[PDB]
C-alpha cells in the first residue's frame, strides 16, 4: 500500500492538470495560432502526456494495473473451428493488447498452420486455407466492432458530453438542412474523386 | 526515372503506421500520396459542414459541437455516437 | 482479474480520452497546419476551439485506419503482397461507404 499523503498530493496535481486541459480545450485558435508549434492544441497534447505519466505513477503507488477500462481491453473469444487448438491460437492472435492489434490474412493463416503442425492435426493445405479465411473474416468483424465502440464511447470532451442527435439544429431549420444536403452530395463526390485519382495514377504508371 | 516528391506535411512513418494499425503490413509508394489526399478531402468535408453550422449560429469560431454535428453526417466513422 | 485504480479527483472516462489522444499517429503540429491549410480557403476570419481540432484528428485517423482495415480484410493471398491504390478502391466498393 502506498503513502496516503503522497497519493493525496498526486491526486490534487492530477486534478490540476485536468483543469488546465479543460482550459486549453476551450481556447479559440485563429489561423496564425494554427501555424504555431506552441499553440494551445500542442500545449494541451503535451499536458495530456504529462497527465498519463502521472496516472501511471499513481498506478505504481496503488499497485494496480495500468488499465483504464477501454473497450479494446475487453477480450474477444473465438470458438470458430472444430479444432480447439486452432481456436485458442486465434483468440491469442486477436487479443494482443494495444491500439495496433489487427492481424492480416497471413497472420491468421500462420496461426492456423502453426496450431496444426504443433499439435499434429494432420490437416491438409486447402482445409487450412479455408479455415484461415473463415477465421480471418470472423475476427475482422469483431476487431472492427471493438475499435468502433472504443471510439464512440471515448470521443471528445466535456464540451461534447451533452451532445444528443435530437438536438441537431438542422432538424428545426429547413434552409440549414438543405445546405447540409447539398454539402453531402459534394462530399461524397470529392471522396470518390480522390480514390479514383490515385487508382488512375496507379494504372498510368 | 524514379523521383522523390517533396512534402511539408504528414511524414511516411505515420502513414506506414496508420496502414499497419489497419492490419496492412506493406504499402506501395502511391499510398503515401493517396493517404495525404484522402485525409485532406475528409477534413474538407467535415469542416465544410462544421462551418455551415458555425455560420448558422452566427459565430466566427468553429466549436467541437460544430465538429460533432458535422462528423455525424460523414457516414460510418462517428455512427452511433451520443446515442 | 487485474486490480483497477480509480482516482478520487478524476473520472476514468476522462483518463481514457487523454490516453487515446496519446495514441494518435499523426504528428499534431503537421495536423493542425493541415487544418489551417483547409480553413484558409473558407474564411480568413475562422477560428477553432482546440477541442475541435482534437475531435477532427481523432475522427480523421479513425477514418483512414478503417480504409486500411477494409483493404486488409479484402486481401486474401498465400504470399503477402504490397497494398496498392486499386486495392483501396476495390475494397471500398466491396465493403466501404456509398
Curated annotation (Swiss-Prot), chain A:
- Could you tell me the keywords of this UniProt record? Acetylation, Apoptosis, Centromere, Chaperone, Chromatin regulator, Chromosome, Coiled coil, Cytoplasm, Host-virus interaction, Isopeptide bond, Nucleus, Phosphoprotein, Repressor, Transcription, Transcription regulation, Ubl conjugation
Q: Where is this region: Interaction with histone H3.3?
A: 2-205
| Tissue expression pattern | Ubiquitous.
Source species, domain of life: Eukaryota
**A single GO cellular-component term on record:** nucleolus
The UniProt PTM text for this protein says: Sumoylated with SUMO1 on multiple lysine residues. Phosphorylated by HIPK1 upon glucose deprivation.
Question: Impact of altering residue 41 to E?
Answer: Abolishes interaction with histone H3.3
Give the coiled coil ranges: 1-36, 177-205
| Cell compartments where the protein resides | Cytoplasm; Nucleus, Nucleoplasm; Nucleus, PML body; Nucleus, Nucleolus
Inducing stimuli: Upon mitogenic stimulation by concanavalin-A.
Residues bearing Phosphoserine are 32
Give this protein's Gene Ontology molecular function annotations.
Answer: enzyme binding; heat shock protein binding; histone binding; molecular condensate scaffold activity; nuclear androgen receptor binding; p53 binding; protein homodimerization activity; protein kinase activator activity
Q: Where is the signal peptide?
A: none
Q: Which GO terms describe its biological process?
A: androgen receptor signaling pathway; cellular response to cadmium ion; cellular response to copper ion; cellular response to diamide; cellular response to heat; cellular response to sodium arsenite; cellular response to unfolded protein; chromatin remodeling
Primary subcellular site in the record, as a coarse category: cytoplasm
Family indicated by similarity: Belongs to the DAXX family.
What function is annotated for this protein? Transcription corepressor known to repress transcriptional potential of several sumoylated transcription factors. Down-regulates basal and activated transcription. Its transcription repressor activity is modulated by recruiting it to subnuclear compartments like the nucleolus or PML/POD/ND10 nuclear bodies through interactions with MCSR1 and PML, respectively. Seems to regulate transcription in PML/POD/ND10 nuclear bodies together with PML and may influence TNFRSF6-dependent apoptosis thereby. Inhibits transcriptional activation of PAX3 and ETS1 through direct protein-protein interactions.
State the encoding gene. Answer: DAXX
Swiss-Prot record, chain B:
- Please give the annotated consequence of changing residue 21 to H: Found in a patient with a neurodevelopmental disorder; uncertain significance; results in early developmental defects when expressed in zebrafish embryos
> Known consequence of changing residue 18 to P?
In TEBIVANED3; results in early developmental defects when expressed in zebrafish embryos
What effect is documented for mutating residue 26 to C? Answer: In TEBIVANED3
List every position bearing N6-acetyllysine.
12, 72
- N6-succinyllysine sites (modified residues): 12, 58, 60, 72
Main subcellular location: nucleus
Give a GO cellular-component term.
Answer: nucleoplasm
Q: Which GO terms describe its molecular function?
A: DNA binding; protein heterodimerization activity; RNA binding; structural constituent of chromatin
According to the UniProt entry, which residues carry Phosphothreonine?
61
Q: Which residues carry this modification: N6-(beta-hydroxybutyryl)lysine?
A: 12, 58, 72
Which locations, inside or outside the cell, does it occupy? Nucleus; Chromosome
Where N6,N6-dimethyllysine occurs along the chain? 1
User: Where are the N6,N6,N6-trimethyllysine modifications?
Assistant: 1
Modification type N6-methyllysine: residues:
1
- GO process annotations (BP): chromatin organization; negative regulation of megakaryocyte differentiation; nucleosome assembly; protein localization to CENP-A containing chromatin; telomere organization
Q: How is it modified after translation?
A: Acetylated as part of spermatogenesis progression prior to histone-to-protamine exchange. Demethylation is performed by JMJD6.
**Modification N6-glutaryllysine, positions:** 12, 40, 58, 60, 72
Annotated positions of the Phosphotyrosine modification: 32, 69
Q: Which residues carry this modification: N6-lactoyllysine?
A: 12, 58, 72
Q: Give residue numbers for the modification (N6-propionyllysine).
A: 12, 25, 58, 60, 72
Outcome of swapping residue 72 to R: In TEBIVANED1; results in severe early developmental defects when expressed in zebrafish embryos; results in defective cell cycle progression when expressed in zebrafish embryos
Location in chain, cross-link Glycyl lysine isopeptide (Lys-Gly) (interchain with G-Cter in ubiquitin): 72
* Result for mutant: residue 13 to A: In TEBIVANED1
Tell me, how does this one assemble? The nucleosome is a histone octamer containing two molecules each of H2A, H2B, H3 and H4 assembled in one H3-H4 heterotetramer and two H2A-H2B heterodimers. The octamer wraps approximately 147 bp of DNA. Found in a co-chaperone complex with DNJC9, MCM2 and histone H3.3-H4 dimers. Within the complex, interacts with DNJC9 (via C-terminus); the interaction is direct. Interacts with NASP; NASP is a histone chaperone that stabilizes and maintains a soluble pool of Histone H3-H4 dimers.
By what name is this protein known? Histone H4
Q: Which organism is it from?
A: Homo sapiens
Curated annotation (Swiss-Prot), chain C:
Q: In UniProt terms, what is the effect of altering residue 6 to K?
A: Reduced binding of histone H1 to histone H3.3-containing nucleosomes
Q: Which residues carry this modification: N6-glutaryllysine?
A: 20, 43, 79, 86
| Location(s) in or outside the cell | Nucleus; Chromosome
Modification N6,N6-dimethyllysine occurs at: 43
Modification sites for N6,N6,N6-trimethyllysine: 20, 43
Alphabetically sorted, this entry's keywords are: Acetylation, ADP-ribosylation, Chromosome, Citrullination, Disease variant, DNA-binding, Hydroxylation, Intellectual disability, Lipoprotein, Methylation, Nucleosome core, Nucleus, Phosphoprotein, Ubl conjugation
DNA-binding: present as a keyword of the record? yes
Phenotype when changing residue 81 to L: In BRYLIB1; uncertain significance
Locate the N6-acetyllysine modifications and list their residues. 20, 43, 79, 86
Record PTM Phosphoserine, positions in chain: 21, 50
N6-lactoyllysine sites (modified residues): 20, 43
Instruction: Please give the residue positions where the record annotates the modification N6-(2-hydroxyisobutyryl)lysine.
Output: 20, 28, 43, 86
Residues where N6-succinyllysine is found? 20, 43, 86
> In this entry, which stretches build a coiled coil?
none
Ubl conjugation listed as a keyword: yes
Modified residues annotated as N6-(beta-hydroxybutyryl)lysine in this record: 20, 43, 86
Q: How is it modified after translation?
A: Acetylation is generally linked to gene activation. Acetylation at Lys-86 (H3K122ac) by EP300/p300 plays a central role in chromatin structure: localizes at the surface of the histone octamer and stimulates transcription, possibly by promoting nucleosome instability.
| Modified residue annotations for N6-methyllysine | 1, 20, 28, 43, 86
Q: What is the effect of changing residue 12 to R?
A: In BRYLIB2; uncertain significance
The molecular function terms of the Gene Ontology recorded here are: nucleosomal DNA binding; protein heterodimerization activity; RNA polymerase II cis-regulatory region sequence-specific DNA binding; RNA polymerase II core promoter sequence-specific DNA binding; structural constituent of chromatin
Give the family from UniProt. Belongs to the histone H3 family.
What does this chain do? Variant histone H3 which replaces conventional H3 in a wide range of nucleosomes in active genes. Constitutes the predominant form of histone H3 in non-dividing cells and is incorporated into chromatin independently of DNA synthesis. Deposited at sites of nucleosomal displacement throughout transcribed genes, suggesting that it represents an epigenetic imprint of transcriptionally active chromatin. Nucleosomes wrap and compact DNA into chromatin, limiting DNA accessibility to the cellular machineries which require DNA as a template.
In Swiss-Prot or TrEMBL terms, this protein is called Histone H3.3
State the organism of origin.
Homo sapiens
Which gene underlies this protein? H3-3A
Amino acid at each position: 500500500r502506498g503513502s496516503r499523503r503522497q497519493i493525496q498530493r498526486l491526486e490534487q496535481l492530477l486534478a490540476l492538470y485536468v483543469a488546465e486541459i479543460r482550459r486549453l480545450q476551450e481556447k479559440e485558435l485563429d489561423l496564425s495560432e494554427l501555424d504555431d508549434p506552441d499553440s494551445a492544441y500542442l500545449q494541451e497534447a503535451r499536458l495530456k502526456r504529462k497527465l498519463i505519466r502521472l496516472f501511471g505513477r499513481l498506478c505504481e503507488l496503488k499497485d494496480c494495473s495500468s488499465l483504464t477500462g477501454r473497450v479494446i481491453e475487453q477480450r474477444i473469444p473465438y470458438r470458430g473451428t472444430r479444432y480447439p487448438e486452432v481456436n485458442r491460437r486465434i483468440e491469442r492472435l486477436i487479443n494482443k493488447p494495444g491500439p495496433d492489434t489487427f492481424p492480416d490474412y497471413g497472420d491468421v493463416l500462420r496461426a492456423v498452420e502453426k496450431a496444426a503442425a504443433r499439435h499434429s492435426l494432420g490437416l491438409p493445405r486447402q482445409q487450412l486455407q479455408l479455415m484461415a479465411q473463415d477465421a480471418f473474416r470472423d475476427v475482422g468483424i469483431r476487431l472492427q466492432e471493438r475499435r468502433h465502440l472504443d471510439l464512440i464511447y471515448n470521443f471528445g470532451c466535456h464540451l461534447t458530453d451533452d451532445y444528443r442527435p435530437g438536438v441537431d439544429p438542422a432538424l428545426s431549420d429547413p434552409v440549414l438542412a438543405r445546405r447540409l444536403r447539398e454539402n453531402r452530395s459534394l462530399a461524397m463526390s470529392r471522396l470518390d474523386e480522390v480514390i479514383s485519382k490515385y487508382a488512375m495514377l496507379q494504372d498510368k504508371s | 526515372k524514379v523521383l522523390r516528391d517533396n512534402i511539408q506535411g504528414i511524414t511516411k512513418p505515420a502513414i506506414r503506421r496508420l496502414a499497419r494499425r489497419g492490419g496492412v503490413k506493406r504499402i506501395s509508394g502511391l499510398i503515401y500520396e493517396e493517404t495525404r489526399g484522402v485525409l485532406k478531402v475528409f477534413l474538407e468535408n467535415v469542416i465544410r459542414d462544421a462551418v455551415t453550422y458555425t455560420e448558422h449560429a452566427k459565430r466566427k469560431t468553429v466549436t467541437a459541437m460544430d465538429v460533432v454535428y458535422a462528423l455525424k453526417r460523414q457516414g460510418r466513422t462517428l455512427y452511433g455516437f451520443g446515442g | 482479474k487485474p486490480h483497477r485504480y480509480r482516482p478520487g479527483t478524476v473520472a476514468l472516462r476522462e483518463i481514457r480520452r487523454y490516453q487515446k489522444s496519446t495514441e494518435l499517429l499523426i504528428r499534431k503540429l503537421p495536423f493542425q497546419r493541415l487544418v489551417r491549410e483547409i480553413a484558409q480557403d473558407f474564411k480568413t476570419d475562422l477560428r477553432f476551439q482546440s477541442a475541435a481540432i482534437a475531435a477532427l484528428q481523432e475522427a480523421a485517423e479513425a477514418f483512414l485506419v478503417a480504409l486500411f482495415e477494409d483493404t486488409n480484410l479484402c486481401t486474401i493471398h498465400a504470399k503477402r503482397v504490397t497494398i496498392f491504390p486499386k486495392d483501396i478502391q476495390l475494397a471500398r466498393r466491396i465493403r466501404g461507404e456509398r
